[PDB]
Design an enzyme around this catalytic site. Structure first.
Site, PDB file in Angstrom:
ATOM      1  N   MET A   1       0.802  -1.214   0.000  1.00  0.00           N
ATOM      2  CA  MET A   1       0.000   0.000   0.000  1.00  0.00           C
ATOM      3  C   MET A   1       0.836   1.266   0.000  1.00  0.00           C
ATOM      4  O   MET A   1       0.488   2.251  -0.652  1.00  0.00           O
ATOM      5  CB  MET A   1      -0.918   0.030   1.220  1.00  0.00           C
ATOM      6  CG  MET A   1      -1.916  -1.093   1.262  1.00  0.00           C
ATOM      7  SD  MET A   1      -3.381  -0.559   2.109  1.00  0.00           S
ATOM      8  CE  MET A   1      -2.743  -0.266   3.825  1.00  0.00           C
TER       9      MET A   1
ATOM     10  N   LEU B   1      -6.034   6.403  -1.252  1.00  0.00           N
ATOM     11  CA  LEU B   1      -6.475   5.285  -0.416  1.00  0.00           C
ATOM     12  C   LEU B   1      -7.999   5.116  -0.466  1.00  0.00           C
ATOM     13  O   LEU B   1      -8.510   4.094  -0.926  1.00  0.00           O
ATOM     14  CB  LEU B   1      -6.021   5.548   1.037  1.00  0.00           C
ATOM     15  CG  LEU B   1      -6.144   4.673   2.305  1.00  0.00           C
ATOM     16  CD1 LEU B   1      -7.424   3.878   2.291  1.00  0.00           C
ATOM     17  CD2 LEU B   1      -4.954   3.749   2.426  1.00  0.00           C
TER      18      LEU B   1
ATOM     19  N   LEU C   1     -10.365  -1.507  -2.099  1.00  0.00           N
ATOM     20  CA  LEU C   1      -9.829  -1.642  -0.752  1.00  0.00           C
ATOM     21  C   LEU C   1     -10.987  -1.749   0.232  1.00  0.00           C
ATOM     22  O   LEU C   1     -11.236  -2.816   0.797  1.00  0.00           O
ATOM     23  CB  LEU C   1      -8.938  -0.433  -0.439  1.00  0.00           C
ATOM     24  CG  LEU C   1      -7.996  -0.378   0.772  1.00  0.00           C
ATOM     25  CD1 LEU C   1      -8.792  -0.208   2.021  1.00  0.00           C
ATOM     26  CD2 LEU C   1      -7.161  -1.634   0.859  1.00  0.00           C
TER      27      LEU C   1
ATOM     28  N   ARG D   1       0.863   1.173  -3.936  1.00  0.00           N
ATOM     29  CA  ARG D   1      -0.497   1.339  -4.426  1.00  0.00           C
ATOM     30  C   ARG D   1      -1.034   2.751  -4.215  1.00  0.00           C
ATOM     31  O   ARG D   1      -1.722   3.294  -5.074  1.00  0.00           O
ATOM     32  CB  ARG D   1      -1.436   0.330  -3.735  1.00  0.00           C
ATOM     33  CG  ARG D   1      -2.845   0.301  -4.328  1.00  0.00           C
ATOM     34  CD  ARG D   1      -2.820  -0.112  -5.813  1.00  0.00           C
ATOM     35  NE  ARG D   1      -4.124   0.049  -6.454  1.00  0.00           N
ATOM     36  CZ  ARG D   1      -4.670   1.226  -6.751  1.00  0.00           C
ATOM     37  NH1 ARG D   1      -4.012   2.345  -6.474  1.00  0.00           N
ATOM     38  NH2 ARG D   1      -5.881   1.289  -7.296  1.00  0.00           N
ATOM     39  N   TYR D   2      -0.728   3.339  -3.067  1.00  0.00           N
ATOM     40  CA  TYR D   2      -1.226   4.669  -2.760  1.00  0.00           C
ATOM     41  C   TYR D   2      -0.118   5.680  -2.478  1.00  0.00           C
ATOM     42  O   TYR D   2      -0.250   6.852  -2.804  1.00  0.00           O
ATOM     43  CB  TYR D   2      -2.172   4.586  -1.558  1.00  0.00           C
ATOM     44  CG  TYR D   2      -3.251   3.535  -1.709  1.00  0.00           C
ATOM     45  CD1 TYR D   2      -3.541   2.651  -0.664  1.00  0.00           C
ATOM     46  CD2 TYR D   2      -3.966   3.401  -2.908  1.00  0.00           C
ATOM     47  CE1 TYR D   2      -4.510   1.660  -0.808  1.00  0.00           C
ATOM     48  CE2 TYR D   2      -4.935   2.406  -3.058  1.00  0.00           C
ATOM     49  CZ  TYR D   2      -5.197   1.543  -2.002  1.00  0.00           C
ATOM     50  OH  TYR D   2      -6.145   0.562  -2.134  1.00  0.00           O
TER      51      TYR D   2
ATOM     52  N   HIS E   1      -3.624  -6.167  10.673  1.00  0.00           N
ATOM     53  CA  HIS E   1      -4.579  -5.134  10.291  1.00  0.00           C
ATOM     54  C   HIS E   1      -5.915  -5.821  10.033  1.00  0.00           C
ATOM     55  O   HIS E   1      -5.974  -6.862   9.384  1.00  0.00           O
ATOM     56  CB  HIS E   1      -4.124  -4.371   9.039  1.00  0.00           C
ATOM     57  CG  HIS E   1      -4.945  -3.149   8.758  1.00  0.00           C
ATOM     58  ND1 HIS E   1      -6.286  -3.210   8.429  1.00  0.00           N
ATOM     59  CD2 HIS E   1      -4.646  -1.828   8.838  1.00  0.00           C
ATOM     60  CE1 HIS E   1      -6.773  -1.990   8.328  1.00  0.00           C
ATOM     61  NE2 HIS E   1      -5.798  -1.130   8.571  1.00  0.00           N
TER      62      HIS E   1
ATOM     63  N   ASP F   1       8.516  -1.629   9.823  1.00  0.00           N
ATOM     64  CA  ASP F   1       7.812  -0.696  10.695  1.00  0.00           C
ATOM     65  C   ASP F   1       6.977   0.293   9.873  1.00  0.00           C
ATOM     66  O   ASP F   1       7.214   0.510   8.676  1.00  0.00           O
ATOM     67  CB  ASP F   1       8.805   0.079  11.560  1.00  0.00           C
ATOM     68  CG  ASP F   1       9.217  -0.685  12.789  1.00  0.00           C
ATOM     69  OD1 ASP F   1       8.319  -1.052  13.579  1.00  0.00           O
ATOM     70  OD2 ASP F   1      10.432  -0.913  12.964  1.00  0.00           O
TER      71      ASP F   1
ATOM     72  N   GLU G   1       1.361   1.815  11.782  1.00  0.00           N
ATOM     73  CA  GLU G   1       0.645   0.803  12.557  1.00  0.00           C
ATOM     74  C   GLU G   1       1.381   0.358  13.830  1.00  0.00           C
ATOM     75  O   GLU G   1       0.761   0.180  14.876  1.00  0.00           O
ATOM     76  CB  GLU G   1       0.380  -0.426  11.687  1.00  0.00           C
ATOM     77  CG  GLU G   1      -1.007  -0.516  11.073  1.00  0.00           C
ATOM     78  CD  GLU G   1      -1.141  -1.728  10.155  1.00  0.00           C
ATOM     79  OE1 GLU G   1      -0.800  -2.851  10.597  1.00  0.00           O
ATOM     80  OE2 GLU G   1      -1.585  -1.560   8.996  1.00  0.00           O
TER      81      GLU G   1
ATOM     82  N   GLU H   1       0.090   3.409  16.402  1.00  0.00           N
ATOM     83  CA  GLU H   1      -1.076   2.682  16.902  1.00  0.00           C
ATOM     84  C   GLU H   1      -0.704   1.856  18.122  1.00  0.00           C
ATOM     85  O   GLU H   1      -1.309   1.998  19.186  1.00  0.00           O
ATOM     86  CB  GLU H   1      -1.661   1.761  15.816  1.00  0.00           C
ATOM     87  CG  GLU H   1      -2.538   2.464  14.771  1.00  0.00           C
ATOM     88  CD  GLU H   1      -3.045   1.525  13.668  1.00  0.00           C
ATOM     89  OE1 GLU H   1      -3.562   0.436  13.992  1.00  0.00           O
ATOM     90  OE2 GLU H   1      -2.942   1.882  12.471  1.00  0.00           O
TER      91      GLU H   1
END
Lengths: 354, 356
Positions: free
Chosen positions: A9, A25, A31, A99-100, A198, A274, A277, A281
């Site tokens: 991503m 995104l 997605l 992807r983004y 995730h 890393d 997330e 998070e």
């Protein structure tokens, strides 16, 4: 001439590639199924709304996503090995396509043609397949092939999953074990190992997506190596909006267990380096905010782990050394995947065609 | 030498069509889930029981009348004990026993018989390779209640086999049974048959509890596909969901109709149970397959039932458990800290073991 493209991503390298990243995104209906008819329109709204909080997060962790650096490092390190391990495929040039995030598939593909690549491998950095990740990324590759390479110059093959690759399993077990060394010996066997991946929207899960079960396979294989010494559990993080997401939130479980356990350890089971997330998070959120920050610890992300890198190089060698430009499961995934613009024939996408 | 009791456990099924009422009563009398009550449920349980009986009796009627669960369970247990007599001599007389959570014989009944047989050691062998607090967890809580009521001076020393997702005999029986069933498929299209491992689903509020079930089933599926070298496309899906509440998705029936038109073969595998019962004989055979217009390319893998390789596997599992000296897996104390019940076990170490 042999292109090894690592893909995921992505993430904003600089604090402000954020609104662009986020917009890209949420504009992808492949997605999160937000609106089959107005995803893009809805996307720039959600993007302008979430940018402030996210932007502040990338600042609380240095000022950017480390994804690109780690992905580039891994890609070239894997290629150096293939050069010596697969001299049969001449030089292996490292590539990265998000992807983004920044280096988009379009940009990367331009380069590859400019560098004169003939054979390429789309190497998904997600060990576990999901239509939302690998699928979306493959639908993008198809669009690029059509717009950029009509003469079908490049011959592609894809590594679409690898839940139990040896290096992967071995690297995670070693890291889990040494992290357990930080807990006091008399409590070490009691620490609960929470594998945090995730989450996924129930809409995707209910299409019969392959992701949930594949993560579970990686987890169990790791516990076998560790001889089931500690209590473990697969839970999920992230999740956005009112729509329902998957089985037990990493956040809620951690909070509920805090008063009951001698300790907890979080394992970035579904990613290879890393990123927001783990660094936020988990580190600042779940851990660095709980009253139990002490009995809470996180397992090192794979990043530059050599067992892991060697496992990836091996994974590639097995791939190159064979037919199948994709696994046996892919045709089923595209049969079950939901998209406004899907690849109708996997056979036309990956292969010579010249 | 005093007998060692090997007790096979599982929720159960009505042996014969008339048991349906009692089965359904017990089911709706359990408030470990189902309702809240205690005083006005010995009632509502019988009201919801009478209300359901007709539908459920017609179902068993459609499958030859009655559930085959008790039959297979008592057989499997007997075959396993016969091997154990030779394999584990120091626990010498191994006696067959079954204890169902809602069907006959309930836990209390079997306990009484064990006490009258003079059993000193007993093994609560959960028939579910995959642990769920709603199933294996339910059995354990009943066992506890009975131990307190029928054996306050604990003459019996219990231990529990709470899960076994990748026992070798299990993975081997499923492989073989799947290959066998695949061969009765054309041949030019045998490798393209999609294997749909279908397990009883769980309500989303039980899954979001952190329950172990979903992941363990996935563990069994991956190990089977490994044995089969991923020659075929596969997917783990779920069945039996009922109600307005949200259930763990990838609905077997729903997905079978979807793929029907676009696949030239589909196999359903009873991945989470060990013999035939309402789920395979009725829900799949009569529902999914029986009423589909793709009946032809839809086949169901054979239930393990009396499979010899599978029986030997259960023997190894029991032998290992007895000789490990562990009273339960390292996972059990976590399942109980995450499970939801109105009358749960507070201390697993007090439930299992010698308390002379």
């Amino acid at each position: 001439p042999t292109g090894i493209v690592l893909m995921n991503m992505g993430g904003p390298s600089k604090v402000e590639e954020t609104y662009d990243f986020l917009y890209q995104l949420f504009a992808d209906n492949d997605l999160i199924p937000i609106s089959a008819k107005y995803q893009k329109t809805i996307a720039k709204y959600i993007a302008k709304f979430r940018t402030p909080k996210i932007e502040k997060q990338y600042r609380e962790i240095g000022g950017g996503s480390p994804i690109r650096k780690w992905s580039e490092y891994q890609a070239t390190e894997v290629c150096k090995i293939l050069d010596k391990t697969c001299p049969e495929t001449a030089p292996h040039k490292p590539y990265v396509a998000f992807r983004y995030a920044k280096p988009l598939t379009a940009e990367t593909y331009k380069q590859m043609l400019k560098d004169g690549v003939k054979k390429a491998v789309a190497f998904s950095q997600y060990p576990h397949f999901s239509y939302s990740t690998t699928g979306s990324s493959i639908n993008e590759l198809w669009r690029q092939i059509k717009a950029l390479d009509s003469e079908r110059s490049i011959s592609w093959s894809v590594i679409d999953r690898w839940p139990t690759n040896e290096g992967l399993i071995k690297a995670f077990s070693e890291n889990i074990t040494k992290k357990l060394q930080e807990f006091p010996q008399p409590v070490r066997d009691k620490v609960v190992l929470l594998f945090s991946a995730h989450s996924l929207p129930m809409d995707v899960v209910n299409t019969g997506d392959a992701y949930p079960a594949e993560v579970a396979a990686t987890v169990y294989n790791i516990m076998q190596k560790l001889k089931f010494k500690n209590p473990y559990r697969l839970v999920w993080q992230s999740q956005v909006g009112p729509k329902p997401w998957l089985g037990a939130q990493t956040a809620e479980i951690a909070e509920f267990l805090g008063p009951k356990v001698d300790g907890l350890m979080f394992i970035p089971i579904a990613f290879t380096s890393d990123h927001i997330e783990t660094l936020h998070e988990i580190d600042l959120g779940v851990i660095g905010e709980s009253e139990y920050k002490d009995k809470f610890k996180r397992c090192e992300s794979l990043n530059g782990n050599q067992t892991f890198i060697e496992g990836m190089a091996d994974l590639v060698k097995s791939h190159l050394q064979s037919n199948q430009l994709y696994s046996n499961q892919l045709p089923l995934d595209f049969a079950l995947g939901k998209s406004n613009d899907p690849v109708k024939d996997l056979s036309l996408v990956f292969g010579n065609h010249e």
